[PDB]
Design a binder for this molecule. Structure first.
Ligand code: NA
Ligand code: NA
Ligand code: NA
Ligand code: NA
Lengths: 289, 289
C-alpha cells in the first residue's frame, strides 16, 4: 500500500505531521521516532517500508518544531515533551481500524530511542519498545555547562523583549564544538555526505532542558513492558558504554542486540535484513503475531 | 511601606500574580516560593513582612495554576516549569527599577525549596538561595505508580476529547491516600484547622511530570551561588534524611541550619525570629548589605 500524509493533535495544542505506512490488514503497529534534531525524512522511511511489508502499520512523524510539524522555536528539543507527544500519538493511532490496540509498539533511533524508552516508562498502552543506538547523555563536559546556561538565561530575557530565539551551531566558525554538541557535529558531515539535509542549528534552550532530563532515572519503570535495545558495538557518537549503562538500569523483560563491528550509523551498510528480522522476531514474540 | 499587587509575564505566555513588599530604599531582593500546591497567601506573607522590615524587597507570587495566577489545568505542578518561571521572575526584578540587580536571592519553602534549588542550579544571576524544609522526592511507593500513570494516560486522551482535566483528592473516600500525596494529606488538616484555605485537589498529571524530575540531578550545579538549606530535625513529611542527602550532593559554598526538635511546619510556632535572623545573616554575608 502507498504511504499517506497524516497529522494529529497534541495535548498542548500542536499539529504534528507525518507519514502512515498501512499494513494490508488489521494487526500490529509501530510509531517511529528519528534521531537528534532530525525530521522523519532520512533512513527511517525505508525501515518503515520494510516493517509495513511484514504486516506492521507504521507511523513516522516530525517531532515538535521539526520538519513539517508545528512548534516554535524550531529545532528546539524537549525530550519530556516529545515523550508526552508519543502518548498522544498512541491515542491517535488506536483509532485506526488497521491497528490492534494491544499491538502498538514504539521504535526510536538515536535521540528518538531516548524518547521511546521514556514514553514506554510511562505508557502501559504500549505493547513493546525498541531503542536503536539511543542517545543517553547530552551533558558533555559539565564544566563547560556554565556558558550555555548563561546563554539560556540571556535567551529567555531577550525573547521576553521580542528578540528571536538564540541558536548554537554544531560547529563554531573557529572550528570549536559547543559543549553538548559533539554527536551532532560528528554526524552532520556523514549525513550531508550522503545527501541527507541537516539543520546545523539547535536552540540554546535545548541544552537547558536536557540538564533536567536523565533517562537513567525512569527506565526502571518500563517493565513489565518488553523493551529491546539495539547497540552498535563501536558506537563512538552515542557511546556504547552509555547505552549499556542504560540497559543495565532497565528491568526484565529486556533484550539486547549488539551490532558487531558497527558504529552509530554505518550499520546501515551492513546486514540490515538480519537486523530488522531480529527486531521483528522480538515484536512477534512479545506482541503475539 | 504597603504591599502592592504585581504581575509578570512568563516566557511561555502566562501571567503570574503576586504581592510586592518594597523596602524603604533600593537594596537586596528576595523571590519567595510557597509549598506544595499552596498559594502565596499562607505563612509566607508574614515572613516577607519581616524581611521587608530588615531592608529586603520581597516578591511573593502564586505559581502557575495556583491562586490568582494563570495556568490550566489548575493545581498541576511542574517543577521544571516553575523553576523556569523563577528565571522570568529574576528578569522582572532586574528589569524593574526598584532593587539592586546584583542582590536578588531566592527563598523557598517545601516544594518551593525544591524549585528554588533547581532555579539556583541554572541561573547565575541569582546572588543567593535559601531552601527551607525542601521537598526532595514525591515518588512514594514506586510499586504504586501504575494506577496513577494509567490515570495520567487516560486524562490525556479525555482532555483531547474535550473533557475537563482529571484531579485526585488528597484523601480518597475510603480514607486512603494516593501514592505521592502523603505530605499533602498530612499538611492539609493542619492548615485548614488554622483557617488557611487548602486546595485539596491535584492534577493527575502532577505525578507524571514529577517522575522525570529529580532535584539531585542538578543541585551539584548550584555552586558557586551561595546556598543555605534549613532542615527541621524531625521532618517526617519531607524526610530529614532526604534533605540531608540533598545537602551532601551540593558543593561549597553551602550552609546548613538544623531546626532542632521541629517538624516539617511546626517550627512556625518556635523561635522564628532567630530562624530568620540566621537566614538574614546568611544573605548579609553573601550579598554585602
Ligand atoms: Na540529560
Ligand atoms: Na548481534
Ligand atoms: Na478522540
Ligand atoms: Na521526582
Amino acid at each position: 500500500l502507498p504511504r499517506s500524509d497524516v497529522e494529529f493533535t497534541t495535548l498542548d495544542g500542536l499539529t504534528l505531521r507525518g507519514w502512515l505506512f498501512p499494513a494490508s490488514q488489521r494487526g500490529p503497529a509501530l510509531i517511529m521516532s528519528p534521531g537528534f534534531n532530525m525530521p522523519k525524512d532520512a533512513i527511517l522511511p525505508d525501515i518503515a517500508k520494510w516493517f509495513q511489508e511484514h504486516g506492521i502499520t507504521c507511523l513516522l512523524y516530525d517531532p515538535r518544531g521539526i520538519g513539517a510539524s508545528d512548534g516554535e522555536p524550531r529545532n528546539d528539543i524537549d525530550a519530556r515533551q516529545q515523550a508526552e507527544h508519543l502518548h498522544d500519538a498512541v491515542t491517535w493511532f488506536k483509532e485506526n481500524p488497521l491497528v490492534n490496540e494491544k499491538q502498538i509498539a514504539l521504535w526510536g533511533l538515536c535521540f528518538g530511542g531516548n524518547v521511546t524508552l521514556a514514553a514506554a516508562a510511562f505508557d502501559k498502552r504500549v505493547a513493546a519498545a525498541i531503542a536503536v543506538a539511543p542517545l543517553i547523555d547530552s551533558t558533555g563536559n559539565p564544566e563547560r555547562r556554565q556558558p550555555i546556561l548563561e546563554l539560556a538565561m540571556h535567551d529567555r530575557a531577550s525573547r521576553l523583549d521580542g528578540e528571536e530565539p538564540m541558536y548554537l551551531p554544531y560547529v563554531n566558525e573557529d572550528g570549536s564544538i559547543p559543549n553538548g554538541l559533539q554527536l551532532a557535529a560528528e554526524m552532520m558531515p556523514a549525513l550531508e555526505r550522503l545527501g541527507i539535509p541537516v539543520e546545523n542549528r539547535i536552540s540554546v534552550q535545548t541544552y537547558y532542558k536536557s540538564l533536567s532530563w536523565n533517562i537513567l532515572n525512569v527506565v526502571q519503570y518500563i517493565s513489565p513492558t518488553p523493551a529491546m535495545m539495539v547497540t552498535p558495538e563501536l558506537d563512538v557518537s552515542c557511546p556504547t558504554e552509555d547505552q549499556l549503562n542504560c540497559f543495565e538500569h532497565m528491568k526484565e523483560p529486556k533484550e539486547l542486540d549488539i551490532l558487531k563491528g558497527k558504529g552509530h550509523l554505518d550499520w546501515v551498510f551492513g546486514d540490515v535484513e538480519s537486523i530488522l528480522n531480529r527486531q521483528l522476531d522480538f515484536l512477534k514474540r512479545h506482541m503475539a503475531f
